[PDB]
């Protein structure tokens, strides 16, 4: 079922008396394990996810300035000083100028001359630190017994990993249990890191880079920003003037600066959570206790007709579907062989007992043929269907 | 007699011509100046003095701490603010801090504490610039025509210079004139420096020292004090608690440390101007339009007293006071011989022709004897009177 | 207390000229800006002109290049200079103080006692 | 040249009311707003120097208030002795301007 249309697919076998077997997962691949009288099982990774993180830092990639004030004060008395330098929402800087005779003063030298402006954030990245005891895994798992897809979404299993629990005793109608082991937290690297919001597009990033860009920033609630320098440009003084200029956005070299890192969602659709790209987990997986419906029941007998005719997949292995005309509920035998006297099977089924539920309904059915040509055989006696195959 | 009772008197005689003759004077010193037909002249340096400096620091080197406020917050967050950091009279400082479950938050590391306190200011050293224009210097002159002591204060002649008057004339009446020339403008090497201030008692200081002194300062009038530091130092936290520490009133050290500057007196009698120990001036005097009074008046003839005996005066010269008796204006002639046969006058007069004007004045005489054995002689004829000396 | 005293006042043909003075009392005066302002008998008042604790000016445009503004530290004194008066400039006129620090950016105190300048 | 206008041109108030005169702004002028006042015969005299901000010896019925470009100066009881005339004086930018002035007279 849910493996088949997935990009990239593992076979994993377990020889009979490895009660106990592993195996790797990665967001955008899946696994199919197999045991030698089992059904065999999928394992799939939807995702890892975070709940509620917190609240560190605010950053400021760009600026606007106003209400510019400006103060000025001969060579030989005293230094620049201003009453508005006290408000924390101004930036600030003095210096030494010319000056002379041209403009009042009584002796020529370097004067002073301080300014100072006003300011307020348009948008700004926010940063947060992460809680790993809070990290969550979502796997998903199923049973290969045939069924259409057209119902996948109903058999499907869904599970739930964190720091509290190991695996679930997971439940299946009539074909047993199961039990899923995970390594929880084993991602290449966590900690030491923050998560980065800009507008509804995010990072994550080591908590030692944040500290090195040179962009103003500010502390929890209620303080204001330091460090305020580096977003201002002050030109040289004229007489009595100083022009004051913003660096405008540095939007774009911020965004450039991240591309190296895995890439962060937030989706309010599913309750605020953070759902972290590229992930990876290792576990392991107990077969041992499922059992196989099919075995009680009879042998068919009778007419059956394709509902889709095989069909090649990037896996190396083919699919079909059939339906059973007339008959009891019963059980579809398959073989792959080279000839079609069919002496010998040489090849093995992905599902090891096919049940027709009842009349009127579909299978599945899924093999792993030999390289170079063969024949396909389903149903048996003498109205036995046929289709040739070529690697 | 100024010449006479300062210590270290120099001699300089130069040559009948009316040449040139320069001299350096130094507040410790006096210079008495001869040319062999002219009476002689002494100029003295008095003080240097200044008016009215601009206004530029005050510096605060001891102070006291009235209020402590303290918060803290828990690893979560990094670091937090307190509300009164935005009135510039608080001094503040930061740091992270240990906590746990001892003190009820709930995690290890390094959680975040601020502290505060108002600062004010209990004594304030005072910084001046000087005014180049408003310098003036003042130089007392005095001919040696020998008044009793207690003349001194009338005679004196009390002249001032500066940029503005480069030379001047002193007349002295029925003495003829002369002209001094000063240098004062001699270089810009006076500038460079403060003028500075504690209580009533002051110091001059090179403005590279006094810009980089630790201690917290503020610019002209109203204003709140910046680079507040360093004196107040905070002690090693505990569980977030501090003690914070007001450090010991500087006093002393700065105190001890300007010794090397020559010494400032504010002295406010004399219309609040500055009185500058330590000067030194260098200048010219032109001796020509003296002249000689009384030289064809009676040789003196009656009887003579001392009134206060020949006297040593460790400069080398022998002084001695007289009383004429009887008659005119007179002149009263000296020398000082090897032999009562009298037959050269041996060693050099610093008074060339003393003279009296009414019978009931008094006249100061005053020589330089040659080396080793000597007679010194007063009057002529009959009545005279003699006295006897070595080196 | 703190007074200022504010002088000159009279009457002036249309492109004539005239000096107006004033003098300050009860606060030293190096450390303050100063500036003027005009009222008129349509009693809607404008500002004039304004200099620095720093020997320099600011002038709107309105009359811009017509008049000019100066201290002189060494006597307490303000003078304010016209040229080619027009009869608009028909007005009574105050000088008034700034605060503790050299910007003329502030709100202003106290305000002298008013003299008047008429154009005819 | 920025511009800035009062609601009240003339009005009439009554003994111990309490009077508000609104003043508007063509853009925000952060707050470097002042309140003068007039009688007959004198010069004027300054209140509020900045909003919620008083001189020594202001009369504790006077305050006044707002943010942005919109203002309010208002007084809690009239006075007669206090009665006469109002400005409203902005001074952010370059081009000083005071307000149109407003007049008050007990009925």
């Known amino acids: 079922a849910h493996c088949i249309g997935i990009t990239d697919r593992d076979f994993i076998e377990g020889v009979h008396g490895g009660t106990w077997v592993s195996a790797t997962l990665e967001q955008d691949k899946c696994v199919t394990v197999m045991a030698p009288d089992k059904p065999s099982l999928d394992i799939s990774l939807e995702t890892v996810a975070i709940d509620r993180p917190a609240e560190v830092r605010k950053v400021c990639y760009n600026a606007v300035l106003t209400h510019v004030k400006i103060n000025d004060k001969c060579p030989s008395t005293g230094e620049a000083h201003l009453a508005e330098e006290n408000e924390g929402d101004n930036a600030c800087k003095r210096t030494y100028s010319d000056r002379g005779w041209g403009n009042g003063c009584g002796l020529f030298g370097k004067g002073s001359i301080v300014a100072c402006a006003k300011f307020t954030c348009a948008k700004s990245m926010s940063l947060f630190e992460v809680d790993q005891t809070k990290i969550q895994y979502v796997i998903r798992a199923q049973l290969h017994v045939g069924a259409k897809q057209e119902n996948w979404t109903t058999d499907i299993k869904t599970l739930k990993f964190d720091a509290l629990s190991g695996s679930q005793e997971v439940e299946f109608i009539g074909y047993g249990k199961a039990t899923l082991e995970c390594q929880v937290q084993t991602a290449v690297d966590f900690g030491n890191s923050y998560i980065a919001e800009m507008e509804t597009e995010s990072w994550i990033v080591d908590r030692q880079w944040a500290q090195d860009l040179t962009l103003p920033w500010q502390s929890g609630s209620g303080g204001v920003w330091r460090e305020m320098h580096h977003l201002v440009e002050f030109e040289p003084p004229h007489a009595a003037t100083i022009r004051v200029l913003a660096l405008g956005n540095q939007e774009g070299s911020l965004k450039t600066a991240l591309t190296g890192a895995m890439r962060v969602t937030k989706d309010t659709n599913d309750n605020n959570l953070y759902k972290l790209h590229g992930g990876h987990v290792s576990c392991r997986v107990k077969l041992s206790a499922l059992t196989l419906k099919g075995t009680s029941y009879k042998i068919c007998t009778d007419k059956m007709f394709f509902v889709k005719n095989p069909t090649d997949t990037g896996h190396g292995t083919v699919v079909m579907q059939v339906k059973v005309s007339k008959g009891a509920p019963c059980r579809i035998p398959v073989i792959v062989a080279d000839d079609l006297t069919a002496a010998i099977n040489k090849g093995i089924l992905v599902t090891v007992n096919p049940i027709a539920s009842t009349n009127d309904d579909e299978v599945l059915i899924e093999v792993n043929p030999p390289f170079g040509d063969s024949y396909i055989i389903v149903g048996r006696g003498d109205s036995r269907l046929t289709y040739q195959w070529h690697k | 007699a100024h010449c006479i009772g300062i210590t270290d008197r120099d001699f300089i005689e130069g040559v009948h011509g009316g040449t040139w003759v320069s001299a350096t004077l130094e507040q410790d010193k006096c210079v008495t100046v001869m040319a062999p037909d002219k009476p002689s002249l002494d100029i003295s340096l008095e003080t240097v003095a200044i008016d009215r400096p601009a206004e530029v620091r005050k510096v605060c080197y001891n102070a006291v701490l009235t209020h402590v406020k303290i918060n803290d917050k828990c690893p979560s967050t990094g670091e937090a603010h307190l509300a009164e950091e935005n009135e510039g009279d608080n001094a503040c400082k930061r740091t992270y801090s240990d906590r746990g479950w001892g003190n009820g938050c709930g995690l290890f590391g390094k959680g975040s504490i601020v502290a505060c306190a108002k600062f004010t200011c209990a004594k304030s050293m005072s910084l001046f610039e000087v005014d180049q224009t408003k310098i003036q210097y003042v130089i007392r002159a005095q001919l040696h025509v020998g008044a009793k002591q207690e003349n001194w204060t009338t005679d004196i002649k009390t002249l001032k210079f500066d940029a503005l008057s480069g030379s001047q004339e002193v007349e002295f009446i029925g003495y003829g004139k002369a002209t001094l020339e000063c240098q004062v403008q001699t270089a810009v090497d006076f500038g460079n420096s403060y003028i500075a201030e504690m209580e009533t008692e002051s110091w001059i200081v090179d403005r590279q020292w006094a810009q980089d002194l630790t201690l917290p300062w503020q610019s002209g009038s109203g204003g709140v004090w910046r680079e507040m530091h360093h004196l107040v130092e905070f002690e090693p936290p505990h569980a977030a608690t501090i003690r914070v520490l007001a450090l010991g009133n500087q006093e002393g050290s700065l105190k001890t440390a300007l010794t090397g500057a020559m010494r400032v007196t504010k002295d406010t009698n004399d219309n609040n101007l500055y009185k500058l120990h330590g000067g030194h001036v260098s200048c010219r005097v032109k001796l020509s339009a003296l002249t000689l009074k009384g030289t064809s008046y009676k040789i003196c003839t009656d009887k003579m007293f001392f009134v206060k005996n020949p006297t040593d005066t460790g400069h080398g010269t022998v002084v001695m006071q007289v009383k004429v008796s009887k008659g005119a204006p007179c002149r009263i002639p000296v020398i000082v011989a090897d032999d009562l046969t009298a037959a050269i006058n041996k060693g050099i007069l610093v008074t060339v022709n003393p003279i009296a004007s009414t019978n009931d004045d008094e006249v100061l005489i005053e020589v330089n004897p040659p080396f080793g054995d000597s007679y010194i002689i007063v009057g002529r004829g009959d009545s005279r009177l003699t006295y006897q000396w070595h080196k | 207390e703190v007074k200022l005293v504010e002088s000159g006042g009279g009457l002036v043909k249309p492109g004539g000229s005239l000096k107006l003075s004033c003098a300050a009392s009860?606060?030293?005066?190096?450390?303050?800006?100063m500036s003027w302002v005009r009222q008129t008998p349509e009693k809607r008042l404008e500002w004039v002109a304004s200099?620095?604790?720093?020997?320099?000016?600011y002038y709107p445009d309105s009359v811009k290049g017509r008049f000019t503004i100066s201290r002189d530290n060494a006597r307490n004194i303000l003078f304010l200079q016209m040229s080619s008066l027009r009869s608009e400039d028909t007005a009574m006129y105050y000088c008034?103080?700034?605060?503790?620090?050299?910007?003329?950016?502030?709100?202003?105190?106290?305000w002298g006692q008013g003299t008047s300048l008429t154009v005819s | 040249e920025i511009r800035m206008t009062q609601s009240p041109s003339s009005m009439y108030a009554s003994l111990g009311e309490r009077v508000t005169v609104t003043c508007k702004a063509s853009?925000?002028?952060?707050?470097?707003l002042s309140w003068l006042q007039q009688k007959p015969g004198k010069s004027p005299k300054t209140l509020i120097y900045?909003?919620?901000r008083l001189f020594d010896g202001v009369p504790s019925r006077f305050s006044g208030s707002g943010s942005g470009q919109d203002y309010s100066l208002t007084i809690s009881s009239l006075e007669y002795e206090d009665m006469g005339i109002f400005y409203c004086?902005?001074?952010?930018?370059?081009?000083?301007?005071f307000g149109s002035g407003t007049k008050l007279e007990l009925k």
């Open positions: 008034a103080r700034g605060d503790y620090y050299g910007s003329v950016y502030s709100a202003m105190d106290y």
């Open positions: 009860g606060f030293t005066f190096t450390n303050y800006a």
């Open positions: 200099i620095s604790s720093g020997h320099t000016p």
């Open positions: 853009q925000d002028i952060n707050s470097y």
């Open positions: 900045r909003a919620n």
């Open positions: 004086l902005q001074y952010d930018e370059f081009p000083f301007t």
